[PDB]
Amino acid sequence: GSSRKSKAELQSEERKRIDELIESGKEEGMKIDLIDGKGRGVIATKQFSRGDFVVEYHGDLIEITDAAARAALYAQDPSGCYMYYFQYLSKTYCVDATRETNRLGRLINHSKCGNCQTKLHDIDGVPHLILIASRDIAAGEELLYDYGDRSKASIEAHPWL
């Protein structure tokens, strides 16, 4: 197999890698830390390249089916027990991350000026919410993403608006 691996082949391999990490729940390259002037967050312990899978946002998947419940989701503010939500294949889902686990995605802080972005990842039709590096990230940096990145698109599509 000496032929140069395609950009497509690499993405296919990374999809397979991600499926397995999501299956295993193995998490490498991050730790909880205490940050001076902020408190608890999650930091990189190794380098991440722009576009690298960072962590799954792991918790309990809940499907939401009525307009009122959707409004309740959409009207949320990033600041506690914020329930991250998304649209997938004409369904609405949120992830309840309130159970205490060892899975670290739930502990990554919110920022409008972050270094990670969310992405949906399909495993046999089941959407998984993962975090991806928006740029090169150094060991030692706090991981941050925008909790509100999907709100505007969700709100605009709501039947009551």
Numbering used by the authors: 189 to 267, 269 to 350
Please share excerpts from the published article on this structure.
Protein lysine methyltransferases (PKMTs) comprise a subfamily of posttranslational modifying enzymes that transfer a methyl group from the cofactor S-adenosyl-L-methionine (SAM). SETD8 (SET8/Pr-SET7/KMT5A) is the sole PKMT annotated for monomethylation of histone H4 lysine 20 (H4K20me) and many nonhistone targets such as the tumor suppressor p53 and the p53-stabilizing factor Numb. Disruption of endogenous SETD8 leads to cell cycle arrest and chromatin decondensation, consistent with essential roles for SETD8 in transcriptional regulation and DNA damage response. Here we solved four distinct crystal structures of SETD8 in alternative ligand-binding states with covalent SETD8 inhibitors and native ligands.
Strikingly, BC-SAM and APO differ from TC by their distinct SET-I motifs in the context of the otherwise similar SET-domain. Furthermore, the post-SET motif of APO structurally resembles an intermediate state between BC-Inh1 and BC-Inh2 but is distinct from those of BC-SAM and TC. In contrast to the structurally diverse SET-I (I1-3) and post-SET motifs (P1-4) in these structures, their pre-SET motifs show only slightly altered configuration. The differences between these structures highlight the conformational plasticity of the SET-I and post-SET motifs. The BC-SAM, BC-Inh1, BC-Inh2, APO, and TC structures can be readily classified into three distinct SET-I configurations (I1-3) and four distinct post-SET configurations (P1-4). Interconversions between metastable conformers cover a broad spatio-temporal scale in particular associated with motions of SETD8’s SET-I and post-SET motifs. In the apo landscape, the general structural features of the X-ray structures of BC-Inh1, BC-Inh2, APO, BC-SAM and TC are recapitulated by a subset of macrostates (e.g. A6 for BC-Inh1; A10 for BC-Inh2; A12 for APO; A20 for BC-SAM; A22, A24 for TC, 6 of 24 macrostates, Figure 11).
